[PDB]
Amino acid sequence: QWEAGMSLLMALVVLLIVAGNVLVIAAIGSTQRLQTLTNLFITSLACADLVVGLLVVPFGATLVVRGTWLWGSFLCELWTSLDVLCVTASIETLCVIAIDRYLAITSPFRYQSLMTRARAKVIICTVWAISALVSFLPIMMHWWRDEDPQALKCYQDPGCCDFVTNRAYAIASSIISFYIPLLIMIFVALRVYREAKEQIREHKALKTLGIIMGVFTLCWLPFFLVNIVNVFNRDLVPDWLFVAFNWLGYANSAMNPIIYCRSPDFRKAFKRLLAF
Ligand SMILES: CC(C)(C)NC[C@H](O)COc1cccc2c1CC(C#N)=N2
């Protein structure tokens, strides 16, 4: 009855994720002084994290603790698609924030005169449309099915919701959803770091964004490294370890609100907003 021990723990992780990310979104939405363009992009992140806390983790927990999928074959597919979507939209929004800040530091005047709150809302829309496309459509079309009997048995069993995929899908989805935006985020972030260094409160706020980026990479990159090792040698990566690395990724959705707590502007605004 580690089954009940884990059930309660999982419900608290949900709470933390969901409450933290609601708090961030409520701070941004109730403080005019905190509605920078950047923070509009942060809104998108907190939303992806919020969908993780409300939909992805709760259904995931049930799989983890009971060891079977209870929610039918269609919700198995939908759950998986929304999980994959949240991760994709998160890393694409982080790579947009890296690029945005690189242009903000190298051309502050131009940038502030020609990005607006509406033009950001459009970028964000695009991101979620691309995310949804690369996530939902391949899953819906069953492009991810493998031909091995083990795989086929899982797909015919409504009670199996392991993302057992073919090699081609595993590689391609991982490149497109994660490895290329990660590589871009890192390349661009290092250039922002270079230019800041050349130039020397502004810099403390840039530091927070760097931390978010590094932490997101540490949380998700284990899973994505393992994803690739496993397409090459299926025996190499035990399932419980794969699952542990996936939960490290889910944990990222609890982390952002906590990191935002340490920005001084955000803190103040949370104090005000909460009758506190
Ligand atoms: C719902 C499942 C069980 C799937 N969760 C896996 C993880 O949360 C993130 O999943 C992914 C996100 C983006 C791209 C991906 C991916 C798993 C694979 C694969 N091959 N390609």
| C-alpha span between 171 and 179 (Å, rounded) | 10
Each domain of the chain, given as residue ranges in start order, spans: 1-276
Q: Are 205 and 234 in contact (CB under 8 A)?
A: no
Asked whether the beta carbons of 235 and 28 are under 8 A apart, the reply is: no
- CATH of the domain spanning 1-276, picked from 3.30.450.20, 3.40.50.1000, 3.90.550.10, 1.20.1070.10: 1.20.1070.10
Token pair in block for residue 131: 């995310």
Alpha helices, H only, the chain? 2-29, 37-51, 57-66, 72-106, 108-114, 117-140, 149-156, 167-174, 180-199, 202-232, 239-260, 264-273
Both structure tokens of 98: 């890296």
Residues 73-96 as b or e (16 or more Cβ within 10 Å = b)? eeebbbbbbbbbbbbbbbbbbbbb
Of 25, 19, 81, whose CA–CA distance to 56 is shortest? 81
Place of tokens 């020397």: 200
The secondary element (H helix, E strand) that includes residue 163 is none
170 SS3 class: helix
Q: Which two tokens stand for residue 235?
A: 């025996």
Q: Sign (positive/negative) of CA torsion 72, 75, 80, 83?
A: negative
Contact 46, 97 (CB under 8 A): no
Ligand 1 neighbour 174 (Cβ under 6 A): yes
Atom 15 of ligand 1, nearest CA residue:
174
- Using a 10 angstrom Cβ sphere, with 0-12 exposed, 13-18 middle and 19 or more buried, the burial of residue 115 is middle
Query: CA torsion 83→84→90→93, rounded to 10°?
Result: -140
Nearest residue (CA) to ligand 1, atom 2: 80
Rounded Cα gap, residues 267 and 264, in angstroms? 5
List the structure tokens of 80.
């998986």
Q: What is the resolution of this structure in A?
A: 3.3
Torsion sign (Cα): 118, 120, 122, 124: negative
Within a 10 A sphere around the Cβ of 207, how many other Cβ atoms?
Answer: 13
Residue 256 beta carbon below 6 angstroms from any ligand 1 atom = no
Look up residue 56 and give its DSSP letter.
I
Distances (CA, A) of 222 to 63, 126, 185: 21, 28, 17
Helices 2-29 and 57-66 pack at an angle, to 10 degrees, of 170
* Three-state secondary-structure class, residue 70: coil
Feature table: binding site: 83, 173, 246
Structure tokens at 155: 């797909």
Query: Nearest Cα to 168, choosing from 232, 92, 236?
Result: 232
Q: Are the beta carbons of 12 and 70 closer than 8 angstroms?
A: no
User: Which residue puts its alpha carbon closest to atom 16 of ligand 1?
Assistant: 84
Please state, in angstroms and rounded to a whole number, the distance separating the CA atoms of residues 196 and 203.
Answer: 8
Cα angle 230, 234, 235 (rounded to 5 degrees) comes to 115
Task: Say if residues 18 and 53 touch (Cβ distance below 8 Å).
Answer: yes
